[PDB]
Write an enzyme that holds these catalytic residues in place. Structure first.
Site, PDB file in Angstrom:
ATOM      1  N   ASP B 168       0.921  -1.233   0.041  1.00  0.00           N
ATOM      2  CA  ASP B 168      -0.156  -0.054  -0.193  1.00  0.00           C
ATOM      3  C   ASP B 168       0.801   1.354   0.006  1.00  0.00           C
ATOM      4  O   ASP B 168       1.454   1.534   0.935  1.00  0.00           O
ATOM      5  CB  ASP B 168      -0.974  -0.138   1.247  1.00  0.00           C
ATOM      6  CG  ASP B 168      -1.913   1.103   1.263  1.00  0.00           C
ATOM      7  OD1 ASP B 168      -2.154   1.859   0.261  1.00  0.00           O
ATOM      8  OD2 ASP B 168      -2.760   0.905   2.228  1.00  0.00           O
ATOM      9  N   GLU B 197      -1.953  14.703  -0.137  1.00  0.00           N
ATOM     10  CA  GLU B 197      -2.714  15.875  -0.239  1.00  0.00           C
ATOM     11  C   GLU B 197      -3.774  16.163   0.661  1.00  0.00           C
ATOM     12  O   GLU B 197      -4.493  17.243   0.635  1.00  0.00           O
ATOM     13  CB  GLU B 197      -2.808  16.441  -1.588  1.00  0.00           C
ATOM     14  CG  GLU B 197      -1.670  17.077  -2.462  1.00  0.00           C
ATOM     15  CD  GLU B 197      -2.000  17.533  -3.917  1.00  0.00           C
ATOM     16  OE1 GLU B 197      -2.608  18.717  -3.762  1.00  0.00           O
ATOM     17  OE2 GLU B 197      -1.704  16.993  -4.762  1.00  0.00           O
ATOM     18  N   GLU B 198      -4.313  14.791   1.222  1.00  0.00           N
ATOM     19  CA  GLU B 198      -5.488  14.848   2.124  1.00  0.00           C
ATOM     20  C   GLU B 198      -4.935  14.319   3.386  1.00  0.00           C
ATOM     21  O   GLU B 198      -3.666  14.130   3.745  1.00  0.00           O
ATOM     22  CB  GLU B 198      -6.605  13.911   1.633  1.00  0.00           C
ATOM     23  N   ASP B 220      -5.541   0.993  -5.892  1.00  0.00           N
ATOM     24  CA  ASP B 220      -5.243   1.018  -4.451  1.00  0.00           C
ATOM     25  C   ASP B 220      -4.849  -0.447  -3.989  1.00  0.00           C
ATOM     26  O   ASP B 220      -5.070  -1.290  -5.076  1.00  0.00           O
ATOM     27  CB  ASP B 220      -6.398   1.734  -3.884  1.00  0.00           C
ATOM     28  CG  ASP B 220      -6.640   2.928  -4.241  1.00  0.00           C
ATOM     29  OD1 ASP B 220      -5.477   3.812  -4.702  1.00  0.00           O
ATOM     30  OD2 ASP B 220      -7.726   3.626  -3.812  1.00  0.00           O
ATOM     31  N   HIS B 295      -0.608  -2.445   6.577  1.00  0.00           N
ATOM     32  CA  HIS B 295      -0.064  -1.523   7.493  1.00  0.00           C
ATOM     33  C   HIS B 295       0.769  -2.146   8.334  1.00  0.00           C
ATOM     34  O   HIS B 295       1.433  -1.550   9.272  1.00  0.00           O
ATOM     35  CB  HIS B 295      -0.991  -0.865   8.071  1.00  0.00           C
ATOM     36  CG  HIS B 295      -2.014   0.192   7.669  1.00  0.00           C
ATOM     37  ND1 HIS B 295      -1.506   0.676   6.278  1.00  0.00           N
ATOM     38  CD2 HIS B 295      -3.397   0.445   7.590  1.00  0.00           C
ATOM     39  CE1 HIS B 295      -2.528   1.448   5.854  1.00  0.00           C
ATOM     40  NE2 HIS B 295      -3.839   1.288   6.630  1.00  0.00           N
TER      41      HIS B 295
END
Lengths: 314, 319
Positions: B168, B197-198, B220, B295
């Site tokens: 990821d 950017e978020e 993704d 993660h």
């Protein structure tokens, strides 16, 4: 600094849609910061320097605006405020929406009797926005419900003063950016460009020894504003005297006073009538706050940058 | 795609420090693209072809990690997470820094009871990083406050599966690269390798990358829910093919892209699975690689899913 202030005040960034402002800030800072990140809440954090003392400079990135709440069968938009915009500041104004659409604000009522009754008790439900649409479907594709808008007003010089939308608090953002552009820091310096949570809903995660908010404060130097404790354009950065300030917070204020006195920087003390990090507030005096034509004096902005560089720089 | 995935996943690229990722992408794409541009924020944009229709493929280049927020008098670092790093994932792990510095994550507490209490509700304030320094001065020179670290784990093949850090979304980056390597495009094809950017590391943030386009397709990862005690009611799984994302409030043009992809998959006999609902400038779809242990330092994918995703995109955009 003039072009920096122009770009930041004119950028589109009502609460929730601040990406263009973050991008301008980051592009202005390229070559002047050691790193950056956006935290879990959308706050933009930058840093420079490596001294033992850690100091945060923080300024709000959001601006007031409107949000589209309904669309009628003729294509007229209904709006509600985002932040503290008065309906009186919108009458006959043009609004710029995120996708570039321009709308004109009108008020309901036709007879002299009903319009005067409406304007005497003006609320947002008596306003509408005309985007030139002729039907709901056309307006919906142009400017859907939930679209955000801001004042369609920009930067202009008014005999040495600067006038624009969103001086509150893009002028605070500009001060922080300019400090980072100029400073050789004696501290580890953070800049925090912070988002605002809506009133009624539920620190920035970096540890630091001091935090200094760079804000605007109302400039009470217009006609019939004869009051004690009045902040004035060209009187310098306004240093806030807080009633319940901690011992550590008062030490910061005293430091800034001594710095300003030592280096011949104009300043004024802000006394108001009637988070865990020790904190001070330094404000730019501003006329006509929350109007499309907020006004500042550039020498106040320069003196604020100078104050921070003297206090934090090598 | 093995070497491509190894290089991209092992590359150093936390927030704002993605130079190695962008360099690998451009070296892999040499001779396969018509041009490229790195914008003022670090986004890498590439393009190929000249068809009338313009299509963006976008994947995120940042990886999760940590950022140093303090250094004590003995040289130990205090950290905060960047992205979805769980403190439980960091216990006893090694962290890699930009200059090659390795650090060891430890937890406070010397008695067994203090350590048992701390892990019951583990917080980052109970963690530190040991980089071998003996003083604040030594640590600051090697790893100053504000430095980013990433997992110090790399690519390994596990009985035909691929395991690495930062699948990821480096696996999405790999898919886009492989598409440009093979495609003879019927469109003008843009590849956007995007920085954060978020508030999330992954996502275009609805600000045009300077490229006008008719469609955008995000590549993704999505959680593969096929591990023990996962009750698979329409769960995504390894070897199920690319996961096509159902969007609730999607526009007509966005649902059309999804239907186009379904029809391509069925016509070209490509396995696919539908990522169901849980509960606006450019029409968009999302295609995801099923990934286990997202993660963690050992994110796992099935190579055939990645190949099917590349194939789906080549067939959709090659004619």
């Amino acid at each position: 600094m003039k072009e920096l202030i122009r770009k930041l005040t004119e950028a589109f960034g009502p609460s929730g849609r601040e990406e263009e402002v973050r991008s301008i800030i980051l592009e202005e800072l390229e070559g002047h910061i050691d790193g950056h990140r956006i935290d879990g809440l959308g706050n933009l954090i930058v840093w420079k320097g490596s001294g033992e003392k850690k100091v945060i400079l923080d300024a709000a990135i959001d601006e007031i605006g409107v949000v589209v709440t309904n669309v009628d069968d003729k294509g007229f938009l209904t709006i509600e405020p985002v932040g503290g915009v008065s309906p009186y500041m919108l009458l006959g104004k043009r609004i710029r929406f995120e996708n570039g659409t321009i709308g004109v604000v009108g008020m309901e009522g036709e007879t002299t009797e009903e319009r005067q009754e409406n304007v005497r008790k003006l609320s947002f439900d008596k306003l509408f926005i005309d985007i030139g649409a002729n039907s709901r479907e056309e307006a919906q594709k142009m400017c859907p419900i939930g679209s955000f808008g801001v004042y369609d007003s920009g930067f202009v010089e008014v005999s040495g003063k600067y006038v624009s939308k969103a001086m509150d608090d893009r002028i605070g953002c500009a001060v922080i950016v300019e400090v980072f552009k100029r400073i050789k820091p004696a501290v580890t310096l953070y800049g925090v460009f912070s988002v605002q949570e809506e009133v009624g809903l539920v620190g920035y995660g970096v540890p630091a020894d001091e935090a200094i908010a760079i804000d605007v404060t109302d400039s009470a130097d217009t006609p019939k504003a004869i009051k004690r404790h009045a902040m004035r354009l060209s009187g310098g950065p306004a240093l806030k005297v807080k009633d319940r300030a901690s011992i550590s917070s008062k030490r910061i204020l005293e430091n800034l006073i001594e710095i300003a006195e030592k280096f011949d920087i104009k300043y004024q003390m802000e006394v108001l009538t009637f988070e865990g990090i020790p904190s001070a507030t330094v404000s730019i005096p501003t006329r006509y706050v929350h109007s499309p034509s907020e006004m500042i004096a550039p020498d106040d902005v320069e003196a604020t940058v100078d104050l921070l560089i003297r206090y934090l720089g090598a």
